[PDB]
C-alpha cells in the first residue's frame, strides 16, 4: 500500500507502511541533536546516543541487550546536529517486544550514575575511533569556526567534558527535548494501528513542545590544525540556504554540477568541473568535491579538498576559481541536466534501501510533518533551473567564508589570500 500518516493530538507524528517485508523496521525520530545544548552541557547528546542500552523503567540493561539479541534484532542510534533517531529492526513476530524495548528506551530512561560513570570511558573510545580519519575532524572544526552558538556544537564530546557529564544533565536534556511535539514514529513492515497503540502506551505522556533552541548565527573565521599528516585537508564554506527553500534545491544541483563523489571506481570523476579544473594544472594525487550541509535554520555550502601539502595552495585556488566561473554564468545546460540526473539518481538510490527509506520518512516527518512522494521531489528538483544554480554560487562566492584546514599547512593559503 502507500504511506499513511496520523498526527496525534499531543503532537506525535505516526507514519506507517505495510509492504509485507520479512524484516520490519521501526524507528523513532526526535529533534534532539547536538545543536540544542549550550556551553554548560556540551557532549550530553553524545552520551545520550551511547546510553541507549541502559536500564529503563520497564526493562534492565541485561534484559534489553539479551532480549534484542535473543530474537536477533538490531537497535541503533543515528544522530545529526538536529535530529536523533533510534531504530529497531527484526522479524515481524518479535517487533512487539522490539517496540516495547525501543519505546522504553525513548520514553522512560533511568540514567543511573554508576552506568554513566562506566559509559564515559566508552565515550572517549568512540570519540577516538571517530576521529581516526581526517574528514571527521575537519568537518567538526569547520562547523565550529563557521557558526557561533547552535550548529557550532560538536557531535562528539569534548575532552574536558568527559568525566563531568552527570545523570541530571541527561535527565534535563531528555525532559526538555524528548517531548511528543518533536517526535515521529515511523514503521516499515508494520500496521499503522499498532504504531498508534504503542504511541498511546508510550510517546503520549511527554507532550510539551519542549525547550526551544537558539537561532544559529554565522561567524566566519578559520581554524587550522598543524599535525604533520601526509595529506592536507581543507574545507572552505559559506552560509547557504536552509531546509524548506528552493535555494536548497539550487545548492544541491550546484554540488552535483561541481562534483559530489565518484560514480566510477578508480575513475577521475571526469565531469566534476572542480576535478577538471584541478587536473588541468596539477598532476599530484588529489580529491576535490563540493560540500553541502543544510539544517532547518541555516546551511553551509563550499568546497572540500584533499591534496599534497605542497600543491595544497593552487589546487584550492583552482577549485575556488572554478566556482567563480560558475558565479560568472560560465555553464552549459547539458551540464546542469546531468547534475539534475545525478542528484535525482542519488535520491532514488538513497531511498531504495529499507533503512534509508525509514530515515527519509522520519526526517520528512520531523521537518515538515508531511510525506513527499519520491515523484514529487523529482519535479521540484527539475524546478531548479540554470540561473538558480548560478545564484547559489554567487552566494558562496560572496558570503563570508569559514575555513577548516589540517595537515602540513606551510603552503596552505589563508582566507584573505584565498
Amino acid at each position: 500500500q502507500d504511506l499513511e500518516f496520523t498526527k496525534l493530538p499531543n503532537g506525535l507524528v505516526i507514519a506507517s507502511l505495510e509492504n509485507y517485508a520479512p524484516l520490519s523496521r521501526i524507528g523513532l525520530f526526535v529533534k534532539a541533536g547536538s545543536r540544542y545544548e549550550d556551553s554548560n552541557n556540551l557532549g550530553t547528546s553524545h552520551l545520550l546516543r551511547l546510553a541507549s542500552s541502559l536500564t529503563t523503567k520497564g526493562a534492565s540493561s541485561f534484559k534489553i541487550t539479551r532480549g534484542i539479541e535473543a530474537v536477533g534484532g538490531k537497535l541503533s542510534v543515528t544522530a545529526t546536529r538536529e535530529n536523533m533517531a533510534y531504530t529497531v529492526e527484526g522479524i515481524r513476530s518479535d517487533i512487539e517486544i522490539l517496540m516495547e524495548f525501543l519505546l522504553n528506551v525513548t520514553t522512560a530512561p533511568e540514567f543511573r550514575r554508576w552506568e554513566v560513570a562506566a559509559l564515559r570511558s566508552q565515550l572517549k573510545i568512540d570519540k577516538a575511533v571517530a576521529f581516526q580519519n581526517s574528514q571527521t575532524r575537519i568537518i567538526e572544526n569547520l562547523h565550529d569556526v563557521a557558526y557561533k552558538n547552535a550548529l557550532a556544537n560538536p557531535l562528539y564530546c569534548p575532552d574536558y567534558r568527559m568525566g563531568k557529564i552527570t545523570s541530571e544533565e541527561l535527565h534535563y536534556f531528555v525532559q526538555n527535548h524528548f517531548t511528543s511535539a518533536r517526535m515521529a514514529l515511523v514503521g516499515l513492515g508494520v500496521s499503522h494501528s499498532v504504531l498508534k497503540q504503542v504511541a498511546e502506551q508510550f510517546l503520549n505522556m511527554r507532550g510539551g513542545l519542549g525547550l526551544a533552541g537558539a537561532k544559529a548565527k554565522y561567524r566566519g573565521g578559520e581554524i587550522r590544525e598543524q599535525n604533520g599528516d601526509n595529506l592536507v585537508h581543507a574545507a572552505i564554506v559559506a552560509e547557504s540556504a536552509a531546509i524548506g527553500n528552493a535555494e536548497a534545491n539550487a545548492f544541491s544541483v550546484l554540488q552535483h554540477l561541481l562534483g559530489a563523489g565518484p560514480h566510477i571506481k578508480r575513475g577521475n570523476n571526469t565531469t566534476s568541473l572542480l576535478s577538471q579544473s584541478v587536473a588541468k594544472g596539477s598532476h599530484q594525487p588529489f580529491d576535490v568535491s563540493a560540500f553541502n550541509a543544510s539544517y532547518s535554520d541555516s546551511g553551509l555550502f563550499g568546497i572540500y579538498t584533499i591534496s599534497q601539502a605542497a600543491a595544497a595552495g593552487e589546487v584550492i585556488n583552482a577549485a575556488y576559481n572554478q566556482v567563480k566561473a560558475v558565479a560568472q554564468g560560465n555553464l552549459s545546460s547539458a551540464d546542469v541536466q546531468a547534475a539534475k540526473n545525478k542528484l535525482k539518481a542519488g535520491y532514488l538510490m538513497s531511498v531504495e534501501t529499507s533503512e534509508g527509506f525509514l530515515s527519509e520518512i522520519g526526517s520528512q516527518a520531523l521537518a515538515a510533518g508531511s510525506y513527499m512522494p519520491p515523484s514529487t521531489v523529482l519535479q521540484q528538483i527539475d524546478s531548479v533551473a540554470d540561473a538558480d544554480v548560478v545564484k547559489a554560487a554567487k552566494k558562496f562566492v560572496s558570503g563570508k567564508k569559514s575555513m577548516a584546514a589540517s595537515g602540513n599547512l606551510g603552503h596552505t593559503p589563508f582566507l584573505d589570500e584565498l
Partner: peptide, 30 residues
Amino acid sequence: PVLDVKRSGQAAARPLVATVGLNVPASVRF
C-alpha cells in the same frame, strides 16, 4: 591512545551522522 581498535581518503561532501548501538559496528558517514 591506540584508538582502541584501529582501522578512508574519500573526501566528505555531505554532513556527518554518528552511529552507534547494540550491534558491534559503529561509525560516521558524510
